[PDB]
Amino acid sequence: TQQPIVTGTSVISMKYDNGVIIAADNLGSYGSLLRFNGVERLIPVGDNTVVGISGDISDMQHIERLLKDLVTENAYDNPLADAEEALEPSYIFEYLATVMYQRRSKMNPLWNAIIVAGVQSNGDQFLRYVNLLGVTYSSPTLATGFGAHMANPLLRKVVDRESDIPKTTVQVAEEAIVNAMRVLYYRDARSSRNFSLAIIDKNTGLTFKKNLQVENMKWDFAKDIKGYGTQK
Amino acid sequence: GYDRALSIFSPDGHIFQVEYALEAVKRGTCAVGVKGKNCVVLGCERRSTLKLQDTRITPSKVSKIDSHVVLSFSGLNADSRILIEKARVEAQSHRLTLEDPVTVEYLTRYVAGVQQRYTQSGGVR
Amino acid sequence: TTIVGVKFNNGVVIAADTRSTQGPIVADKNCAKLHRISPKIWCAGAGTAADTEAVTQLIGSNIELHSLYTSREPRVVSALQMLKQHLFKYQGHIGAYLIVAGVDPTGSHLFSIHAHGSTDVGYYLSLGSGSLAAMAVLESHWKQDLTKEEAIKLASDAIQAGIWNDLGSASNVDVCVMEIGKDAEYLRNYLTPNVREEKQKSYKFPRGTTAVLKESIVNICD
Amino acid sequence: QFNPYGDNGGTILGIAGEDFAVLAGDTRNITDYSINSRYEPKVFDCGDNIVMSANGFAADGDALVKRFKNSVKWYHFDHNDKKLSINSAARNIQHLLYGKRFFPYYVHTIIAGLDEDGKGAVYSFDPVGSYEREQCRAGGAAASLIMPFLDNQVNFKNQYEPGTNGKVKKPLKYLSVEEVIKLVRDSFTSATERHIQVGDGLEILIVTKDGVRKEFYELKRD
Amino acid sequence: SDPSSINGGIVVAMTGKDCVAIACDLRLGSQSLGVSNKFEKIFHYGHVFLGITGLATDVTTLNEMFRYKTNLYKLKEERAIEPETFTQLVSSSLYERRFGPYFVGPVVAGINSKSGKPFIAGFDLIGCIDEAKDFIVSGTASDQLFGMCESLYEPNLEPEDLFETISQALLNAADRDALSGWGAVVYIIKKDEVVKRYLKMRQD
Amino acid sequence: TTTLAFRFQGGIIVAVDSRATAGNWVASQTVKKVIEINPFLLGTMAGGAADCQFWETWLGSQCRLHELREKERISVAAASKILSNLVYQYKGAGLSMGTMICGYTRKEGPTIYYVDSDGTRLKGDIFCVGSGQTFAYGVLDSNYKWDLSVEDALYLGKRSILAAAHRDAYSGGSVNLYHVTEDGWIYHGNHDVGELFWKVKEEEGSFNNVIG
Amino acid sequence: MDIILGIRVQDSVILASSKAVTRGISVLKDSDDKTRQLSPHTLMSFAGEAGDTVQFAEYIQANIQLYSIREDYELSPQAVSSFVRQELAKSIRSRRPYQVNVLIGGYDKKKNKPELYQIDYLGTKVELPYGAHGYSGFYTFSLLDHHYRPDMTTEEGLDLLKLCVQELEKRMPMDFKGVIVKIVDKDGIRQVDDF
Amino acid sequence: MDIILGIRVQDSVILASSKAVTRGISVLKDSDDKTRQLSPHTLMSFAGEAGDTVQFAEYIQANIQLYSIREDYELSPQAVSSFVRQELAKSIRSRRPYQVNVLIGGYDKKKNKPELYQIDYLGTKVELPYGAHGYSGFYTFSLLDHHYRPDMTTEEGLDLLKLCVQELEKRMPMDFKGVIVKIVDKDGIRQVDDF
Amino acid sequence: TSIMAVTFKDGVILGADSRTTTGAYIANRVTDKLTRVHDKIWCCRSGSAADTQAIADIVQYHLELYTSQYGTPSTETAASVFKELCYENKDNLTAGIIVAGYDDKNKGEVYTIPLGGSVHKLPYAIAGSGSTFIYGYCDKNFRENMSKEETVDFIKHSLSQAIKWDGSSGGVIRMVVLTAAGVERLIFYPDEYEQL
Amino acid sequence: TSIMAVTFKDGVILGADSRTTTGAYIANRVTDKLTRVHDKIWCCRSGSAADTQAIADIVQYHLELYTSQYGTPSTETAASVFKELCYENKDNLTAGIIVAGYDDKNKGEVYTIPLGGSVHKLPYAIAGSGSTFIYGYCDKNFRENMSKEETVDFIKHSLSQAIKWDGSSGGVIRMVVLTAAGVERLIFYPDEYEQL
Ligand SMILES: [Mg+2]
Ligand SMILES: [Mg+2]
Ligand SMILES: [Mg+2]
Ligand SMILES: [Mg+2]
Ligand SMILES: [Mg+2]
């Protein structure tokens, strides 16, 4: 048993017709102190998987090393490590999910909420969640922390059920994700303007975008707001 | 720990350490058991090569395992004490858990089991 | 519960869902959560249900008496000031959280009020367990100088976000529109789901199924 | 302090017919007032004509199903591909559960299938392994809402034959698979209306001598 | 310890076509111990019926209080109180004990003598009105009652059909509650006749 | 819960209720609170359901191994002590068990041992365990005799559970009856308390306080 | 205090109350009368917290005696029981509640009927054919449920009461030092001096 | 368990132990023998936590019986008591201590003297002319301090014991259902079947 | 919350962020924490919003009644009324208030009233959760008798950093300028102050 | 405690105060919080003195054994060893450590290891109770590729303010300069830095 110290907020994601998108801001908070501003919380595994992690950053860095070690280990005595016997999103998730549930069962959890996003060998989209309790679930849209409360409602307006996925393009999906990140910046006190976004497409592969910023913000209406009731 | 297999099979299918243990029994003083209609008698030989012995305190050849069962033996005297102690402990353990004293057959089966165990355990004769 | 308030060019609109729960159990599928303080000052609340209703009626009562005394139509700042001072006095033991909206001779207003007695001003506000689902929709689409039509749409879309995504929010959408210089128009069940459930069975029993020991006429007349 | 447990909501229902058995459950997964998934399967085909659901804390539920499926695999390996009977599976699950008696699987487990005489069978477990063969058993969030209805409509409790006035009970006539599926759908439709954790979808697994079949029905999403 | 579940018991009310029904179990207990099988929880003031579940001392106290208040109401108003008006009186009376409440779950049932409209209403222990068209439930088996009522209920039932529906709702709900049962009473209420029926049920 | 067991001329009568509750919620009315350890030995369920089920099933496995090894029926004394010694090892860990181990052997005759999760092992003639034990004891104590017939003894045990099922909120559902003889136990059926109550009331004239 | 029982038969009400007074470690008295006569045909037995029991009982006694003098009339048992219930219901939300449980046994001279009321410290009133407080009912109700008849004589009620006390003396852990038994009928209140 | 008394007279040791076994609300048994014979001339009575009492007693009994067989000799009461004290002293710093208090009454055949040892669950041993555990001594020691004589007969010890039990039955709140009395002398151990 | 008040040559300027949080949720991102208790006496509020609003409303009432009887009150008088409420009700309040005002006789004045109800007259004052991160910056960069533009820059830069590090602070930067010329409201948006 | 490490053109400089408190009592006013784990790899310690001394001693041991086998370790390697101890024993440690070192290949590097056991490579780092007060100042005044004299001034000014506001910080300002030229120790007394 512990308590999280340096933490990362929401990770948000969704499926679209040819793949998945995932995003997370670049902040590492120390309680109410916005201590670290250059933290990458999206960690790619090969060219077909991206693992987005929220929660305790020290545990994230540990998981990051486990994934790095997983790639090394898979390459051992494996002539098809860059082909048929390459790591799949489903392999990477199941491994993490096993670790997370084992850790909670020893009453020593990895204080995280994780979303594994990727594309399988057969082109199928993969998107599944796991947290410190070892709880797992899948959905067309997935989000952690504040994103679960604010991002999911917005993303579910685009893909409300399974049948909406083929109808959703990457431009529409990315647009919805980018808007959700803006909304979270407005309303989450532990968020930052800077974020990373990753797209895993079955045709164009893995596109990793760093140093993105929340833009087109509405603040002008603040000038007219005066007092808290009677003040003019 | 010392794990050496002392009791092993020979080409002719004999375990010599067990057979040589019988030769130790052959050397031991004679013991005899006879059961009547309403009694059992245990007779034991005392070799008279040892006089000046104190018969009050010298270990007697027949030992009570419980108030209703006795054990006599032929062979190594020191070895017999280990079996007698184990049998006595088991007799009390039986009374404690089953709430009934051991049958003569049960006590025999236990002692015999200990003897067998020492014929296929490592590091023991 | 999901409640929103949205300001527009010449008025204000307040909206709410209609689910009323006892914990995880639903008691009323069509609760009217939109209330009156005065004819053109409406409110809706979350928290302790009896406290939101009781505090609305009490201030509404005094607002009426005040309006009569002063020969003036009641102001939203008056409902606001009377509410917060009452709630503050009780240090949040009256679990009343409200969104208060209305028009008066001064203009159109939108306030949120919290159990401990703090108030807020805004052009769009949300409240209840569905507050975050609603605010996500409001932060995505609210703009300055909305028309009455746009503001009703934004408000009811914000409630829908709560209905679908919040377990404590469900069923229908109630709306009340307070435009300046007009009568406030209250739109009960402004949105309903189309379609109606039909069960596989009818459970209507055969008569005489229940066993009975006694019968008697109850004298209800004097 | 770290809480190793959680509640993912959900409601499941197992009914044993004369020559069949069903095990149903909603497809909604939740924490607190949020929806995690509208479709997250909860009832599983575990092989050898056995269906299983472990409702409550989904991490423990997934672990237990995973371990039992594994136990079926090793039962075949160890006993010449012998078919694991429903009664043997039940006793096996008791041991899986009781092995964690002092750090339990926070779940209410139900399995369904056919016994060795071809008759329908449902077994119900508590979190630490106590079990019983039953005819009808609801588990999870809305179990208290469903079971009284089932006592009334499956076992005809409190129902007497008209004209006799409580002297003759309603006879217990056998129900068909189609009749049972109606009671299941109506049970979940009612539960969805009055319980906030129940909704989204209903997946039923039917077990006969011909094998395992699935049926899916939508539920309200609010 | 929990005051609302020391004595046990349940009340349910339903609306039908030109009629209302209200029903209750007869148990009073001290936790596990059954004390009385004749503790009726439904009372009436004129043509307005009030069922009360919860802590039995408060049930008795509130009955006496509402008899008190409806009697004075009648003397002054020169007419019997109506269900809608009484509902507000119950709400008012409960909320005046906001920070020292009666541990009860009241249920009002009746027909307006002037409009002929059937009426039911429920309250939490501090007066929040639940104003539902179909049915109102209360007591230690309220979950069970919600389940029964949601599935068994259909609108516009005739008086004698409504009797069967509400009776089966109560009975089967009570049989899944340890602290409810030991007998049951059902009131069928029409504009100018009320029938009271005692049900036969298991006594465990 | 209400369970009882008593010794008499014809052996042992075992009678239990069938109700299981989780708070006020009645989880089941069809619970088997008599565990058939083997064809000669019975155990009652009270306290923890899993604890009683699991360890009394395990007890049957130990009794079976005993008679394989010793070629003789296990005594009720020895069987009961296997269970009491086991739970005593777990003492403090949180097992919950209140059971009567009932049997009829040659050397002992009809024998009952109350075994309990804090290590208690008591031999006796009459035992009653559960939330409704006090109600059952009253009927038992005032009507018990050694020279009861098997028929009258069965009824007494049935009537004593009924008494408890009526007054105790957490007891009821149905009554399960068993008669333990030297040649093994004999099941004497499941009796719905609902139907039993009215039947007994009429035939016996008891429960005048209740209207029927 | 500990055991207080009551049984209403054909023509009378019988109250049985334990004699022991225990203060922690020692039994200070074995002849305590846990009852007060409220009026010639109304008797109240009591049990609960030390001090509060007698204070409450004597307070009720005084109020009923005052009423009897003012009106030159004996209140009905039902009226007395309703008065007592209100006092206890009032008490439960007080600064320091009376922790007292009572049984009221009276003979209504107007209706010519015995009546037994059971009221707990919360103000929970019930009219019964037989009643008790504390754990007393747990041991005795199964016997009363079996043997009770509404047409029992006073002698039959006493015999059934003996059976109840015998079961209490067998299965109760505490020594309550026997019971004092009193009968309430049309002729008033009298104590059975041999029990 | 509850009351265990002991008194050493001229030529014997008398142990009196209550018969009741109470599990919370009900008295489950009224004929329980809270004693074990450790050897022909040594008896141990016990009281304490449920389960631990009998488990400890039977464990001691087995160990002494084992010693008796191995050496064909009966240990002196003093030796048996020292063994028991060590086991309890060992137990008190264990993971889960035996919560058992004992009295050891024995006749030393070598010295031709009766001996009574009192040992509590901590391993606190004392040799006494008379002893008890729990609250038993609070009621009885004033009577024993007054009447006791080291030259008392067995019959006089039994009469003094009756007086002690009578005082316990009067002032103790709990019903301990009488006592089983056993005498330990040169001829061994016997039970007084009428007390 | 990040609030400050700074005296300068021509008077005094109050500054504040606009973020109001309930845990990690931003309940209001456009809050006005600069409140008017008299024409040229304003305050910056920190702590319980309910408490600081209630206090400010009472003070505004007291100064309105004061003005009706004795004419325009001094900034010191306003601070005293604040202090009296905060000190006497210290057990039931969580309020940290900075009082700033302009007289013609006294010019710009700043009073800070921390949790206990003590009063401290200062050249400038900082308060709120975000103030902790700018004690060093403000101490190094403050000068007496700055110009209006320098003081606006000083406050803008200071609160920019407070917002940068404190998650409880954010939104826009509001300011109120108090001089002989009158009362001027200023607002600065994220895209302006974040790039400083 | 007030500690910091700053990279500059020629390498890196560590800085620290010298105050060690037991409650409000200053148990040591001349503490050396700049500790050497290798020739040109030093660290700044914050948190439990017992824990940070124990950790530093173990690290010094590990790097000594590393050097005997594999030659001079990198600053990254030193940080990893620190992290490994801090992360794996996070339940039983209260340590906040800044690691600074000079390679010829990598030049000046700074790693901060906060409470949880995470590692963060930064241009400069601040830590300790007094760091809170200089987040604003340090962010505004830090530049990359400063000169030795500029970096000394930056650290001197920064810790001067941290000491000014934090009661847990004080005494002298110690500094250690790590360059290709070698290792230089600096000390600055109160009469020097208080007047800045
Ligand atoms: Mg729902
Ligand atoms: Mg919803
Ligand atoms: Mg019931
Ligand atoms: Mg019952
Ligand atoms: Mg910020």
Residue numbers in the entry:
A (entry chain a): 1 to 232
B (entry chain Q): 1 to 125
C (entry chain H), D (entry chain Z): 1 to 222
E (entry chain I): 1 to 204
F (entry chain Y): 1 to 212
G (entry chain J), H (entry chain X): 1 to 195
I (entry chain N), J (entry chain b): 1 to 196
Paper text:
The 26S proteasome is the major non-lysosomal protease engaged in degradation of intracellular proteins. The heart of each 26S proteasome is the 20S core particle (CP), consisting of seven different α- and seven different β-subunits, arranged in a cylindrical complex of four stacked rings following an α1–7β1–7β1–7α1–7 stoichiometry.
The pup1G170A-ProA-H7 mutant yCP was purified by affinity chromatography and crystallised after tag removal by Tobacco Etch Virus (TEV) protease. The structural data visualised the incorporation of the point mutation G170A and verified correct autolysis of the yβ2-propeptide. The X-ray crystallographic data visualise that the point mutation G170A leads to significant rearrangements in a loop region of the C-terminal appendage of subunit yβ2. Detailed inspection of the site of mutation reveals that Ala170 would be too close to Arg19 from the same subunit (3.0 Å) as well as to the C-terminal amino acid Asp190 from subunit yβ6′ of the opposite β-ring (2.6 Å). To avoid steric clashes, the guanidine group of Arg19 (yβ2) and the carboxylate of Asp190 (yβ6′) are shifted by up to 1.6 Å. Hereby, the hydrogen bonds between Arg19NH2 and Asp190OD2 (WT: 3.1 Å; mt: 5.1 Å) as well as Arg19NH2 and the C-terminus of subunit yβ6 (WT: 3.1 Å; mt: 4.5 Å) are broken. Furthermore, slight backbone distortions around the mutation shorten the distance between Ser171O and Pro192CD from 3.5 Å to 2.9 Å. This close contact leads to a flip of Pro192 out of the hydrophobic pocket provided by Ile163, Trp164, Val173 and Leu190 of yβ2, however, without changing its trans conformation. The reorientation of Pro192 triggers twisting of the succeeding yβ2-amino acids Asn193-Glu196 outwards on the protein surface (shift of Pro192Cα: 1.6 Å; Asn193Cα: 6.6 Å; Val194Cα: 5.7 Å; Arg195Cα: 4.8 Å; Glu196Cα: 2.0 Å; Glu197Cα: 0.6 Å), hereby loosening intra- and inter-subunit contacts. Most likely, mutation of Gly170 enhances the structural flexibility of the C-terminal tail of yβ2 and impairs the association with subunit yβ3 of the same β-ring/CP half (cis interactions).
